[PDB]
Design a binder for these strands. Structure first.
Ligand code: DUP
Ligand code: MG
Ligand code: NA
Ligand code: NA
Ligand code: NA
Ligand code: NA
Ligand code: NA
Length: 325
DNA sequence: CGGCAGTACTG
DNA sequence: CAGTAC
DNA sequence: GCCG
């Protein structure tokens, strides 16, 4: 990370634009900051900047000011509202729109939110676990959680394949939450298991709150909730579970393993090749309009393994650790 | 000019 | 649907 | 914000 002074100044602006809802500008900063982080040498020329992909004149100028002026004047013109929008949007379930609305309504603190804001069920849970959801757990605990889910799953069907994905699979030392993918090699015994699984996990008091769980739908694909391991010193942890048909195992695994940036890059590439990649499948011959919107369903390509996805995209396979973008 | 990933819940 | 999220 |  030879462009540190540059990044921590840009990360400030990135977050500022993000919480304010200027999503694409924030994306631009995100990519540039990214490029900066994974680069070999400090940059010295505003020609040495434009060169780095993800950095144009606009961005270059700002790094220059960060090197020469040793500071970015833009940072001093950030709305005083940003810290509060950040505070608000860090409540699970509240995004930029809700944060801006609360701010516009005069709310400035979580105390204000707690006592006067109309919260959705999800936001109330997010607020209740505000600090907890901002904390990462040692990967070891993520193991205990994956194991807890797997145990409950395999309880009514030992054939069920359960695997922790996300940051865990990419080998990170700490995890923001636990992402568990569940499927079954017989390609059918995965149907309508959420009902049973979630119920057992609730019986033992493991699950404490549900955020997203359309259980009245037998086609439910994901469960997003909160759990807590037994014993003292335990914090509530975010738990995500997806149940996919074996036929989509590779794409689901690839998707759920991420990283998010990596997935988007993969999908953007697939798109340039007339293909479409999703958590369900990799498709080819996908018809699209001038707006890049899928007009034609295309054809689903066989992808029994992640390697296959990379291969079909003409990419060298990458271990999960090599996808931590 | 205009896309920037593709998808799944919630209310 | 807009919002939020993975 | 960047880039095709
Ligand atoms: O915008 C997103 C978010 C997530 N994902 C995929 C990739 C990601 O690794 C996976 C799980 O999402 P998390 O939000 O749980 N992120 P991750 O587990 O990588 O990191 P963290 O340790 O913060 O949870 O879902 C996307 O494709 N797009
Ligand atoms: Mg995760
Ligand atoms: Na470049
Ligand atoms: Na939020
Ligand atoms: Na969030
Ligand atoms: Na997650
Ligand atoms: Na529900």
């Amino acid at each position: 990370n030879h462009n540190l002074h540059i990044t921590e100044k840009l990360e400030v602006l990135a977050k500022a634009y993000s919480v304010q809802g200027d999503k694409w500008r924030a994306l631009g900063y995100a990519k540039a900051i990214n490029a900066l982080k994974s680069f070999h040498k400090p940059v010295t020329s505003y020609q040495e900047a434009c060169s780095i992909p993800g950095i144009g004149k606009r961005m270059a100028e700002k790094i220059i000011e960060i090197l020469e002026s040793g500071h970015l004047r833009k940072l001093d013109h950030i709305s005083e509202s940003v810290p509060v929008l950040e505070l608000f949007s860090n409540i699970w379930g509240a995004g930029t729109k809700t944060a801006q609305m609360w701010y516009q309504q005069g709310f400035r603190s979580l105390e204000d939110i707690r006592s006067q804001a109309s919260l959705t069920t999800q936001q109330a849970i997010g607020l209740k676990h505000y600090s907890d959801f901002l904390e990462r757990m040692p990967r070891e605990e993520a193991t205990e959680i994956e194991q807890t889910v797997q145990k409950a799953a395999q309880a009514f069907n030992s054939g069920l394949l359960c695997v922790a994905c996300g940051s865990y699979r990419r080998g990170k030392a700490t995890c923001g939450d636990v992402d568990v993918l569940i499927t079954h090699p017989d390609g059918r015994s995965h149907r309508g298991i959420f009902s049973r699984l979630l119920d057992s996990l609730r019986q033992e008091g493991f699950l404490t709150d549900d955020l997203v769980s359309q259980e009245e739908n037998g086609q439910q694909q994901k469960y997003l909730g909160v759990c807590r391991l037994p014993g003292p010193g335990r914090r509530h942890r975010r738990l995500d579970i997806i149940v996919v048909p074996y036929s989509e195992f590779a794409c689901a695994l690839l998707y759920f393993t991420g990283s998010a940036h990596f997935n988007r890059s993969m999908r953007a590439l697939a798109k340039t090749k007339g293909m479409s990649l999703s958590e369900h499948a990799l498709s080819t011959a996908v018809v699209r309009n001038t707006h890049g919107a899928k007009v034609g369903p295309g054809r689903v390509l066989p992808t029994p393994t992640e390697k296959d996805v990379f291969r079909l995209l003409g990419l060298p396979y990458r271990e999960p650790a090599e996808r931590d973008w």
